[model samples]
Target chain A: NPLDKWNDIIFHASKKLSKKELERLLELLALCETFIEKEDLEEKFESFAKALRIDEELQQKIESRKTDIVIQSMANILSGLEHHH
Target chain B: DYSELEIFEGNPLDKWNDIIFHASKKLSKKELERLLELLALCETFIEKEDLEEKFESFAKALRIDEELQQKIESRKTDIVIQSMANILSGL
Candidate 1:
């Protein structure tokens, strides 16, 4: 079993989250803690989205898995939330 | 590769060794050296082509036979989505 918090967040995902997604998130989270890696989320979001569509390695890696996503939606959601007081 | 070498180092390579060993547990002894060299190259140079070329060779060396590309695309996408969720949960 994965960590409870990891499972909880994935369960709340706006769209389907795969098993692999859960796994990498933990690993990425560890990597993300480089806090330098804790980047401006939008640039992180947009640039990575661009890679999802463009970089063949990144594209192929995810496309091969045959997935839909929460990132696009969350990017919008987070952006919308930022307008609050 | 932490080429803080030759300075009468106390722990020049320790922190990076922590990171490297974190991700590289399964890498063979020989390959770990390559990993070090690749990392050391990137540590200083702020460019891509050299890094990319070196990386391709490194991948080739680690592959089943020569450089074959691709992994589960679904997993890749799923991870991206979960990454978003992970970010949001933190906020």
Candidate 2:
């Protein structure tokens, strides 16, 4: 994945989110953290999605939205740093 | 400040004392030291090398030992992929 392309993905994903979607995205992001001994991201996602106990449609949407959500979140942090500076 | 050393301290693998004990069955003190040294070298190289150069340098450094080389080759996919994720995530 090109780093430059990630900006677009982040922007598009941010533009598409609803409040509930953003909140669910946060939950999924929390599930996405890892340590060296942990399972791979895909494996973590599968377990997290299952544990969320949402409908398959909502779960799948959350899965589909993961990268976008993370990129948007990262961008937001950068903006906050810029504001503070 | 959250130093890398702090991040590694009490790592989840620390929970695997039992596994390490079992693994020690197969490794003498010298072999265990060598494994620890290899991991330290990886940590150093990761900070020094650009992503494209990192794996090449890492592989080159390890090429002298057939046993170690074979061990890494056996798990090459997982190692490389995980390293990429770690690198990309700034872990």
Query: Largest DockQ belongs to which candidate?
Result: 1
> In candidate 2, which residue pairs clash?
none
lDDT of every predicted structure (CA atoms): 0.33, 0.35
Question: What is the DockQ score, from 0 to 1, of model 2?
Answer: 0.02
lDDT of 2 by residue, A20-66 (tens): 23333322222222111122334534444355465665444443444
lDDT of 1 by residue, A1-85 (tens): 1122322343343322323343333332222222222233435444544554556675444432222223432343344445443
TM-scores for all candidates: the values are 0.19, 0.21
The stretch of ten residues in a row with the least summed lDDT in candidate 1 chain A is A29-38
Candidate that would win on lDDT: 2
Model 1 chain A TM-score equals 0.28
TM-score of candidate 2 against the unseen true structure: 0.21
Q: What is the lDDT of candidate 1?
A: 0.33
Output the number of the TM-score-best candidate.
2
